[PDB]
Amino acid sequence: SRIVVHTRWASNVDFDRDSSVIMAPPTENNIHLFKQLLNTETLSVRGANPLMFRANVLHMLLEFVLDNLYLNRHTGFSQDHTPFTEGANLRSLPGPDAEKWYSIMYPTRMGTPNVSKICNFVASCVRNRVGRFDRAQMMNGAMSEWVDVFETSDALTVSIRGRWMARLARMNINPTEIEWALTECAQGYVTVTSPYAPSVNRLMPYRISNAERQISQIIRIMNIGNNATVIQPVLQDISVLLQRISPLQIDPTIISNTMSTVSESTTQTLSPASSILGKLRPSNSDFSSFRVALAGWLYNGVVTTVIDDSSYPKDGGSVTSLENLWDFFILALALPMTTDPCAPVKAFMTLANMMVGFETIPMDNQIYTQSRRASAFSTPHTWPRCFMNIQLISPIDAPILRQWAEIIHRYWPNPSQIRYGAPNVFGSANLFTPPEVLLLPIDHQPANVTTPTLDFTNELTNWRARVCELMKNLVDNQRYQPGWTQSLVSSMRGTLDKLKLIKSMTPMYLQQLAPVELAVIAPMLPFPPFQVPYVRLDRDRVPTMVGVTRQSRDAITQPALSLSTTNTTVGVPLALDARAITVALLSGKYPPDLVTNVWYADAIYPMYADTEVFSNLQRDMITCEAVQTLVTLVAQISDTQYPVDRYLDWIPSLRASAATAATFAEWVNTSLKTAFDLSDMLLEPLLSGDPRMTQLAIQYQQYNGRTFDVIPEMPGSVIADCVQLTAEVFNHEYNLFGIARGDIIIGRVQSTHLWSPLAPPPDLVFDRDTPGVHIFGRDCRISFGMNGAAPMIRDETGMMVPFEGNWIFPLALWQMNTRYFNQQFDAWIKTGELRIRIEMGAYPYMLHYYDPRQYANAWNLASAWLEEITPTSIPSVPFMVPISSDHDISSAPAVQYIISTEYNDRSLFCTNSSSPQTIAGPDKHIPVERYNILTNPDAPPTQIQLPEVIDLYNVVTRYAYETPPITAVVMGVP
Amino acid sequence: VSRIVVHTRWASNVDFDRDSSVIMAPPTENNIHLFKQLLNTETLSVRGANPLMFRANVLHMLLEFVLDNLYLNRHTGFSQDHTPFTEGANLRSLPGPDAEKWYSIMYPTRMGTPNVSKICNFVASCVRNRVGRFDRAQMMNGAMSEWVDVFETSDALTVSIRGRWMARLARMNINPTEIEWALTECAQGYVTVTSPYAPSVNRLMPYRISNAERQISQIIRIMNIGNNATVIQPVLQDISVLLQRISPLQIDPTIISNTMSTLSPASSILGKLRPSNSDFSSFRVALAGWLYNGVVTTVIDDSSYPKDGGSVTSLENLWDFFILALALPMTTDPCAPVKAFMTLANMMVGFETIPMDNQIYTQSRRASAFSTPHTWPRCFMNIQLISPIDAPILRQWAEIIHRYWPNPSQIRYGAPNVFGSANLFTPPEVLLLPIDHQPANVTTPTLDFTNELTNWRARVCELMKNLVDNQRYQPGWTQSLVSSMRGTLDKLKLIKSMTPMYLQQLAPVELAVIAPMLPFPPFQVPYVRLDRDRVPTMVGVTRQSRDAITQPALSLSTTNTTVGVPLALDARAITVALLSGKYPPDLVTNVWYADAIYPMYADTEVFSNLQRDMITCEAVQTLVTLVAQISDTQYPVDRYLDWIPSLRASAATAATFAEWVNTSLKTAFDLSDMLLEPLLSGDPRMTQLAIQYQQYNGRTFDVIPEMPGSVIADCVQLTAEVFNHEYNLFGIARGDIIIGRVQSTHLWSPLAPPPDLVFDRDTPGVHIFGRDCRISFGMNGAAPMIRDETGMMVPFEGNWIFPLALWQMNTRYFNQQFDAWIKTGELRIRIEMGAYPYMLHYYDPRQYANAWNLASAWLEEITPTSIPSVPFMVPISSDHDISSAPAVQYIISTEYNDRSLFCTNSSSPQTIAGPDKHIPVERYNILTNPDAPPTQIQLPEVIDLYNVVTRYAYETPPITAVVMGVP
């Protein structure tokens, strides 16, 4: 408000995030914020510090910028009937006293009381370059898509939103075109309801490139950096998603299956059912923790599916044993579920473990012994060479083992991939692979039937075949017999056959039905997952680490050398149990009820009510925009390490420090999060560490040393543009900001003339060129009184001089021993003729009017005002200003104390705007610097003419469109 | 009749003490005690004196008297009385009683002249106008000037002494203004002292000096230390005391406990810490290490090391290397970084493989065993050698070292403007710090990434976890504790200590404030972190004189690690302080430290250091000076009492003397705490010291001191020369003696024998005798006769010549041989003595008992290393004649003299019998001819014993104030 530049004036307000930038009351002091923004070395309802005086100001500017992204929706107009107008349209609004908002928006409705300079200029203006001019109206019954008109405001805001819109609309299309990519995410099988139409000016700004894609990735990649407690719950969220999809029945299923599939060994040394009953659980209740590994699949170079410890027995392995058989079966089943590349070697060593003491062949070291925990082995180098070096396996001592190893060699599941979605609109999916390439630990097979059926065609069914074969090969052993009974082994095979031939709709749904159902979500992932190309063999591909730079090295400002230094943990262990796994594999129980097209798309749509990707896309976009705006500002006033255009340093503000930088960046991040009430990790990982040497990229390397760079890139910040523009323009309007260029001259002067100390008559100032200069830099001590001499200052050479004259002082010396200085100077500047140019550069000030008719003192303990300040900063300058008359007024004294070293008096809200003359009131004339147009039609309104031409009543384009929420146009078909 | 009381220190105007024996030894009493209180150590009785040290002792002798007189003068009131002989005089009123008797003592015309007496008669010639108060200073306190000359009995000796004294003193006074300015700088702007008052010009602040003095003092201090720990350990003690006494920050390991929420890591550390400890000192001492470097080295035990070995699988070793790795970088031992590097390597030896550069070196060898610049490996000096497959872990580690390693700084300190500051390997006001500092207002939470300390915790947590992750560098590790251990690493990396803040910006302040308070200033070394060749190697000094080709004094720099005394610390307490840190819960920096400061600086002791050092340098100055006056050194010397025979010098001579001085002055200042070990830190015949220090490169930096004058030896020359023109005055005479039995009734003293009963040495009737001259005995018991240089056998009589070599070595024989011959017959031998003590024997001219008894005694009491002062039976002059004496002379001086003959007939106004002596009215010439001023030219001529003597009302205040600390 007055001087009204602040928002909430007449516009179509829609919602705020507290970008509160405003003014302060002008008839008195004026700070508008800075007893609330930054008071680092000052403290008051009336203070600010010049040792952080560049952050605060920018910050103030930036929030201002933020305040102005609101939705323009112009509604209706009408020709007018004042004598004042000759057809200029009024904007018709239902608002109360729209008339005042017009007499305000336009100088209209301003009558003919008596001859006033105002009224005179009124009678002279134009009847045309006023009100409506033009618009983009090609439709019927609905407003122009935008309307231009001559109304009062600052066209930055106009151009501001021009660039705002530019950033927005750039991503629109004919909508239904996106029904493609949705159907591609619908897999073509989640049928879709939506209208049929091309672009109808309903902006759908979600056509996005891979730049911001990858950038947001990076951000997540350290946002996820070292926090995996959070990954578990949402993984369960996915598990329940699947629960809402999977038809399985668990407890009595396996109950009947097991009571049917085992063979009789009750009087035959540990009956298998009894043992296995006591092992599994009759724990009949909700059990759904199976979906775990399935959902975890979404990450491989990200997470490491490891198996729980107790899943393995703790006996070093042996032959004559039944629980060995149980558990070895279980693991042979579950290991092909793991992501760990040593899992082959792991099971290898595992069978070696139960092969402790009977079959014994080449052993490499004291760890590759068959007595060592397989899971403990970690590195390619931790893998028994012989495992990968099959010829060390003599088929003589380990015939069965060589057998089985070769089985695994030729027989082992393999990876595949699948597609989803569209970079066409939405950029990459992962960055260490081509777009939408979704590699798979499995090799999906095409399902055809819409209902479950029995069949044994599956790589894992084949594996089960292999393992039952090996088991029968072994249990019948002649070393078993002495440890056992013989009809026992008969019943053993009697079990294993029904085992390998047990009922299970699992593997078919897995190999065929699961994969598409995985693809069902499956960008609809709050965190977009990541994965890395697969590895089945050939240790040389075993990755090393994903090093991420977001800065440089200590002594090396280059990224390409700090690469080894700026690098972060990779992979996490996540231990799982095989029980429910085998439970499911050996028993799939699916009713013929999931009518895929019907069932699944049915299960989905109601869930589809608030599609997050919308929030995700905007999230990431604004994210990267912020990040860019940052990487720019850190190089400006606020240098980082590379001197490029700093602008305001003619303002003295203290130099760069990460501490100061971190402070400012906090203010930023704050404002940012507000901008849409953002609430998640945001640049929080960047001030985590120094965002001063910022250099972004990432890489991963493998056992073959093969390195793989990914280097991000950002297209800039529309904000940063506008803000720099305005910043430059500012340099000449500083007056409008309660901060002044120059210094002040201080000594008790006594005048009655009506003159601003903001522009005092020439006679009153002095300089170095002035004689009487007592020049002081940074050597000034002070003696108290002497024998006959008063307190005398030790001089810059070291001499003692009394306190009066023309003296010069650079501020820092002052801020040093302020207290000393102040306790001394009281009289001899107040009463004495001590006058110093204390030299500040650029500084806050403040004011109060006053009636000149009485005497005026500009002491009023302005000293007291001073001493209130710290030895660390300076108090804003209050001023008493007379009410000068346009003509006669009587004489009264005025004892001033402080004056501006310059003329800078330019700031005023209107006072006495109705008269060609007034007795003594604020001498004010219509500010004729913005409406010269109203006397002559010129000044290309939209052409860039600032600061060369700055007005406040301009080209005005209130918009009007069709603004549907995109969550709403999400109509599903079940 | 009596003689003159040549004295001082008999009318003390003060209670100050010197303990400097200004007694003169009387003649009715004994005399040679003053000649048996010198460097002589072989004396045993009332009587006797060594010939060979005669000259050699006089120095100290005359010196001590001087040491009596630097006392301080004060006001005296105003007396106004007049009597006929005292008409119109402003006598100096004295608060003391019988001061009028003391006036007659100082006022001659005080007494009158009503009759006949050498007093009455000559005082009848004395005026009343050159008596009493002469002239005054307009500068004056009470009833006396700050300098007021007044006619009075006095010795110009004391005058000159205190005059040059005063000169020095006032040459030092300091303005309270610049004083408080100092105190400000001393307080670094954290004192508050003003002074609006009524001025007083008596006030005295004489303490302004240069730097060379303190620098010398620091040198000698180190020398006396001679590398003794017990010297400076208690220094560190006082330090830690005041430190723990002053720091508001609080430590609480129990915090972590809750942070951990009480092996499992927690159990391990809980056993590691003993949750009972209550004492907090040696850590503070680890800090105070940063204050002195040039002599000491912070080191660490290896009981903290994993046997200085370690492995890659011992969880305890994890704890310990963790612990240390944190507690290290703050040390001063320069081999630290590569040492921790190599220790880490040793524990790791076997998984990662790196080239070496010495077979005796071992990648598993002891870091302790590697403690030289030569223990540096060029692979640690070039990482590019480390292929990232050799040991990438260690490569990254070495780079971490190259990068985050601590980095020194400095600050201003001291008040060199007036008192100066002593620093040689650095400018005086420069104060290093092995780390870097930052500005104030830490009243914000203590979190700081940019803190090299948080930096440290961060980087170490990283490298640790990074390594621990693989499970394979650590085989045998089965249960997944990547959860427990690594989350623990997180929690600890997330433990907040306010200590690092104190360290980063507060400790700098504390120590900068301590700096001026040092009764012993620092001694440190230019800190570096790299370039072994730059690494210092030598801290040498030359306890030997420089004027000859002279290697410096042996230094331990080649046997210690670099230069410094070892110092092993506790990693536990240190790293805990690094770990748990909390400031007072309501703290406001300044007011806290204001109150913490006040009473401390309310006390002050550095002025003791000043007095110490100034006296020290003056003392050694005049010391080596007098050395240049005693005998021959490696430079031309000038002796002056060589007219008093004594040989050239040995060392223990001055040694005795040196400690004479040390004792004397310590007793003279009641600062009996020892100051100097002159040769006990120096060398019998040295002239100068000089320091030097060099790096491993061979870059040497070699400093030499400078000398100012010392008026002491000057005034010594002053005094002696006057005595060396006015002799006898104190018990020693030049000349010789003639020995033989002559008798007379014409009365005189053997000091004034007529030159008739005398003969020149080697007179006609000559009888020369060398060392080898042996006797021809008489025949059948006849008179033996002695062989001549020609051979002739002459009897025991004539004029005989013994310069001296043999009588020294053949005393008692000679006595027994020549006794009766001198006793009853002529045997006139001249014996050569040069300068020598004498004695008297009071006797009446009317009676006699044999002096030859006591004479023979004095003979018996001589050794070649000892001579007693010769007694002489002294008669009574009279105002009336009496029965003369046949007096039997045996031995007599060879000369006429006056030592102190004042005046005959102590109170008898006239004298007839015996000699006469009037008053040396000579000395009071202004009292005879007042044409003369007091600075008239009469020196080194006759001394006057009456003067106008400036007396003073200046005042020295004990240096204090009323102030406040950090506001």
Residue numbers in the entry:
A (entry chain A): 302 to 1275
B (entry chain B): 301 to 562, 571 to 1275
How did the manuscript describe this experimental structure?
The particles harbour 10-separate genome segments and comprise two principle protein layers, the innermost composed of 120 copies of protein λ1 clamped together by 150 copies of σ2 (viral polymerases, λ3, are attached inside adjacent to the icosahedral fivefold axes). The outer layer consists of 600 copies each of μ1 and σ3. The array of μ1 and σ3 is interrupted at the fivefold axes by pentameric λ2 turrets which enzymatically cap the mRNA transcripts produced by the polymerase on egress from the particle. Here we demonstrate that vitrification of infected cells followed by cryo-focussed ion beam (cryo-FIB) milling and cryo-electron tomography (cryo-ET) allows high resolution reconstruction of assembly intermediates of a mammalian reovirus, allowing atomic models to be constructed which throw light on some of these fundamental questions.
Unexpectedly, numerous star shaped particles were observed in the virus factories in addition to particles consistent with the expected virion architecture. For stars, analysis focused on the fivefold regions using emClarity16 yielded a reconstruction at 6.6 Å. Broad features of the organisation of the molecules parallel the arrangement seen in the virus—five copies of λ1 (termed A molecules) cluster around each fivefold axis and five further copies of λ1 (termed B), orientated in a similar fashion to the A molecules, are located 35 Å further from the fivefold. Since the 60 copies each of the A and B molecules account for the large majority of the density for these particles we henceforth term them single-layered particles (SLPs). The maximum diameter of the SLPs is very similar to the corresponding layer of virion-like particles, however whilst the latter are roughly spherical the SLP is collapsed inwards at the icosahedral fivefolds by 100 Å, to give the characteristic star shaped cross-section. Superposition of equivalent λ1 molecules between the virion-like particles and SLPs shows that the majority of the movement is caused by molecules A and B tipping inwards by ~35°. There are also significant conformational changes within the molecules, the largest being a hinge-like flexing of two parts of the subunit (the same hinge is used to adjust between the A and B conformations in the virus particles). The molecules rotate by some 35° and slide partially over each other like the blades of a camera iris. Overall the λ1 protein structure allows it to occupy two radically different configurations in the SLP/virion-like particle, but is likely not compatible with stable intermediate structures. The interior volume of the SLP is 59% of that of the virion-like particle, thus the dsRNA genome segments cannot fit inside (the dsRNA in the core of the Reoviridae is already at a concentration of ~410 mg/ml5).
